[PDB]
Amino acid sequence: YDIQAWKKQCEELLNLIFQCEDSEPFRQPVDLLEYPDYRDIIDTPMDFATVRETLEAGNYESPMELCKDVRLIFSNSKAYTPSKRSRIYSMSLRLSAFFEEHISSVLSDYKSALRFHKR
Numbered sequence: 308y309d310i311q312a313w314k315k316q317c318e319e320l321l322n323l324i325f326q327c328e329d330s331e332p333f334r335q336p337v338d339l340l341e342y343p344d345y346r347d348i349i350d351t352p353m354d355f356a357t358v359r360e361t362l363e364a365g366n367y368e369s370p371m372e373l374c375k376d377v378r379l380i381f382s383n384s385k386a387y388t389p390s391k392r393s394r395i396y397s398m399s400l401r402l403s404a405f406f407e408e409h410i411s412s413v414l415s416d417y418k419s420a421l422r423f424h425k426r
């Protein structure tokens with residue numbers, strides 16, 4: 308029932324994501340010099356360095372907010388892809404599965420801790 312435990316759990320999951328080769332296209336903001344269809348199709352860019360810096364700045368109140376930003380990395384990749392078979396999009400699907408598999412307990416524990424706090 309530790310209401311704060313999610314933050315270090317998210318830091319460690321981000322470390323695992325950065326070690327994963329599938330995170331390479333998503334570690335830093337998309338290069339607008341390399342990708343021109345970018346801001347015309349993506350309204351809210353997101354990447355893992357931005358997520359890590361928001362977390363480290365104390366600018367996430369809950370792991371749900373972090374999850375929303377990580378899910379935006381994946382939905383931006385899906386919206387920008389010219390094909391479901393593209394390399395970057397295929398990497399995003401595997402990385403998303405890995406992320407969802409690991410964030411599930413973080414979210415469950417935090418929501419349970421908050422329910423206990425408010426009992």
Ligand SMILES: CS(=O)(=O)NCCc1ccc(F)cc1
Nearest residue numbers: 332335336337338383384387
């Ligand atoms: C940091 S980068 O060197 O510009 N690589 C970005 C690859 C990418 C391009 C479009 C997307 F929707 C998602 C990822």
